[PDB]
Design a protein around this ligand. Structure first.
Ligand code: NI
Ligand code: NI
Ligand code: NI
Length: 264
């Protein structure tokens, strides 16, 4: 298995099965014949197998050669910013003293008061399904949680072609019905840049936190989005490619595994 070198780490992205919005357009990693366990049981598995959950700060420090990672290091991440992240996950993180990354879709968290969040063309959810800014700031101030961008409004599908086939918003040059054309490279870069910039500003404004990482929705990213993320200062990126993060893996291309859980 993985070399124990104070540098190589695994990342585990946790998804609550009751937030069942998975996407057609997205090309997610295979989940078939993988057992869904409870979150508490997951935290107990982590412990008993000898994993040592680490923070993003610890990753950065190991790369800079200041402090090596502990053995069997793992990064836990919780994206999308649903309310259960605060009421269920947060007190377990505290009880086990495990750090985590929480990645915020800021157009969801920051939606106008009294309005519903549209997730898909046929699905809207109440504003209060999501953690409040005050709740996120509290997690950030606990010392246990690193806040990250899950984009502002890239956590959805956009039109890839005239008929109606969808692709992830961040990856594709989107087709514009009003223009009668696709986005050009300049337009595309501008849209993704403004999105990332907005999510970082909103997070800093409301929590005081300067983020330094992006968790790409649906693992969708490319050369252009990585370059643009770098321009806005987000030099840490998390993908859906699985595998060990060995020293030759750039922190812009962090690998992670996806696992589903149930809460009680
Ligand atoms: Ni997500
Ligand atoms: Ni501001
Ligand atoms: Ni506000």
């Amino acid at each position: 298995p993985d070399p124990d070198d104070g540098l190589t780490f695994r990342v585990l992205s946790m998804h609550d099965v009751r937030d069942n919005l998975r996407a057609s357009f997205a090309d997610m990693p295979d989940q078939f014949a993988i057992e869904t366990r409870t979150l508490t049981d997951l935290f107990e598995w982590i412990r008993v197998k000898g994993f040592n959950p680490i923070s993003m700060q610890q990753i950065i420090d190991s790369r800079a050669g200041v402090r090596p990672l502990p053995p069997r290091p793992i990064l836990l991440t919780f994206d999308d910013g649903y309310a259960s992240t605060y009421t269920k996950v947060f007190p377990l993180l505290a009880a086990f003293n495990y750090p985590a990354v929480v990645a915020v879709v800021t157009s969801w968290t920051d939606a106008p008061a009294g309005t519903k969040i549209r997730l898909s063309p046929k699905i809207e959810v109440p504003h209060d399904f999501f953690m409040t800014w005050a709740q996120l700031r509290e997690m950030a101030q606990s010392g246990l949680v690193e806040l990250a961008s899950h984009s502002h409004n890239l956590h959805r599908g956009v039109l890839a072609n005239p008929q109606g086939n969808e692709q992830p918003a961040a990856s594709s040059r989107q087709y514009l019905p009003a223009s009668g054309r696709y986005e050009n490279d300049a337009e595309y870069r501008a849209r993704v840049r403004q999105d990332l910039k907005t999510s970082a500003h909103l997070i800093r404004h409301h929590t005081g936190v300067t983020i330094r990482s992006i968790v790409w929705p649906y693992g969708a990213h490319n050369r252009d989005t990585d370059q643009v993320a770098a321009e806005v200062g987000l030099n840490i990126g998390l993908t859906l490619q699985p595998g060990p993060n060995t020293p030759d893996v750039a922190l812009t291309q962090i690998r992670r595994s996806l696992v589903d859980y149930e809460v009680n």
